[PDB]
Design an enzyme around this catalytic site. Structure first.
Site, PDB file in Angstrom:
ATOM      1  N   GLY A  14       0.876  -1.196   0.146  1.00 48.32           N
ATOM      2  CA  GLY A  14      -0.053   0.025  -0.061  1.00 48.32           C
ATOM      3  C   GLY A  14       0.810   1.194   0.032  1.00 48.32           C
ATOM      4  O   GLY A  14       1.575   1.343   0.815  1.00 48.32           O
ATOM      5  N   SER A  15       0.593   2.222  -0.810  1.00 51.81           N
ATOM      6  CA  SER A  15       1.535   3.421  -1.252  1.00 51.81           C
ATOM      7  C   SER A  15       0.449   4.733  -0.822  1.00 51.81           C
ATOM      8  O   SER A  15      -0.632   4.870  -0.266  1.00 51.81           O
ATOM      9  CB  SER A  15       2.095   3.399  -2.510  1.00 51.81           C
ATOM     10  OG  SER A  15       1.156   3.202  -3.495  1.00 51.81           O
ATOM     11  N   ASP A 126     -13.168   8.881   6.335  1.00 52.45           N
ATOM     12  CA  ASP A 126     -12.843   8.404   5.009  1.00 52.45           C
ATOM     13  C   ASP A 126     -13.311   6.621   5.225  1.00 52.45           C
ATOM     14  O   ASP A 126     -12.467   5.909   4.978  1.00 52.45           O
ATOM     15  CB  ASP A 126     -11.462   8.292   4.763  1.00 52.45           C
ATOM     16  CG  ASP A 126     -10.974   7.863   3.366  1.00 52.45           C
ATOM     17  OD1 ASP A 126     -11.694   8.272   2.283  1.00 52.45           O
ATOM     18  OD2 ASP A 126     -10.144   7.185   3.183  1.00 52.45           O
TER      19      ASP A 126
END
Length: 245
Positions: A14-15, A126
Site C-alpha cells: 500500500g502506497s 474516510d
C-alpha cells in the site's frame, strides 16, 4: 507503548504519501502491518496526537494497533496484520462466491465498529471499502481512521462532516460490499457526480442487494442529515435484516 526496532521489515502493501504500508515481524512472534510515515508528511507532535487517540479506542471491529516507532528513523505505526487485504480488494477477487447472509455479515462488522467511534464521538473521515479490512475469518475491522464519491451533501459544498456525514460514506461502502467491489459513480465526473446526487440520484440497486437493504442504503443517502439514522440504530436495523431476507 512505544516500540523500538524489534521489527523485521519484509514487504510493502500500500502506497501514497503519508505512510508506506510495510509487512514485517515484531519479536518474530507476531505478524504485523507496519505503516511508516515519510519526512515532511506530518509534524512529530501532529502525528503523535492521532496516534494517542487510536490507543484510546478499542473494539473487536477496529484494527487493533500494536506499538509505535517514535524511536527515530522511519517513524511508523505498527498494527496487527489483517490476513486478507482491504475489504475493497477482497471484494474484487473471490467475486461471486458470496452469498447474502454474509455480505450482510460484514456490514454489521463495519457498523459495530462505527457505532463505537460514532459514540466515541469520533469522526472517521474516510469510511470506505478501501479502508476497512478483512481478517480472522469473515471478521471485518476498520482502520486508517483518526473521495466526494463516498462523501455526503454537506461535504461537497461545505466540508461539514458530522458522524452522520459518514453514515452516508457507510452507505456507498455498503453498496460496494454488495456490488462485490465496484466503484460507485464511475462513468461520472466528480464535477458531475454531485449534480446527479444533488438532484436526487442514488446508486442503482446492486443485485445481491435486497429490497430491505436498499431501504437503508437510502436511509444512508437521505439528503438531510437529521433524518439519516445513527450507527447505533443501524446496528439494530441490520440485526433485523440479517435475520431472514
Amino acid at each position: 507503548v512505544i516500540d523500538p526496532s524489534e521489527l523485521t521489515f519484509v514487504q510493502e502493501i500500500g502506497s501514497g504519501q503519508f505512510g508506506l504500508v510495510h509487512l514485517g515481524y515484531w519479536l518474530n512472534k507476531d505478524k504485523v502491518a507496519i505503516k511508516t510515515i515519510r519526512e515532511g508528511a506530518m509534524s512529530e507532535e501532529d502525528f503523535i496526537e492521532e496516534a494517542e487517540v487510536m490507543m484510546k479506542l478499542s473494539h473487536p471491529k477496529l484494527v487493533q494497533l500494536y506499538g509505535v516507532c517514535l524511536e527515530q528513523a522511519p517513524i511508523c505505526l505498527v498494527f496487527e496484520f489483517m490476513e486478507h487485504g482491504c475489504l475493497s480488494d477482497y471484494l474484487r477477487t473471490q467475486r461471486g462466491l458470496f452469498a447474502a447472509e454474509t455480505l450482510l455479515g460484514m456490514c454489521l462488522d463495519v457498523c459495530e465498529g462505527m457505532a463505537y467511534l460514532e459514540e466515541a464521538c469520533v469522526i472517521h473521515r474516510d469510511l470506505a471499502a478501501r479502508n476497512c479490512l478483512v481478517g480472522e475469518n469473515q471478521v471485518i475491522k476498520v482502520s486508517d481512521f483518526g473521495p466526494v464519491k463516498w462523501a455526503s451533501p454537506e461535504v461537497f459544498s461545505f466540508s461539514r462532516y458530522s458522524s452522520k456525514s459518514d453514515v452516508w460514506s457507510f452507505g456507498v461502502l455498503m453498496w460496494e460490499v454488495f456490488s462485490e467491489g465496484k466503484i460507485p459513480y464511475e462513468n461520472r465526473s466528480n464535477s458531475e457526480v454531485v449534480e446527479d446526487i444533488s438532484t436526487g440520484f442514488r446508486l442503482y440497486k446492486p443485485r445481491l442487494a435486497s429490497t430491505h437493504v436498499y431501504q437503508i442504503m437510502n436511509h444512508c443517502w437521505k439528503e438531510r442529515p437529521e433524518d439519516r439514522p445513527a450507527f447505533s440504530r443501524l446496528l439494530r436495523q441490520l440485526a433485523e435484516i440479517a435475520e431472514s431476507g
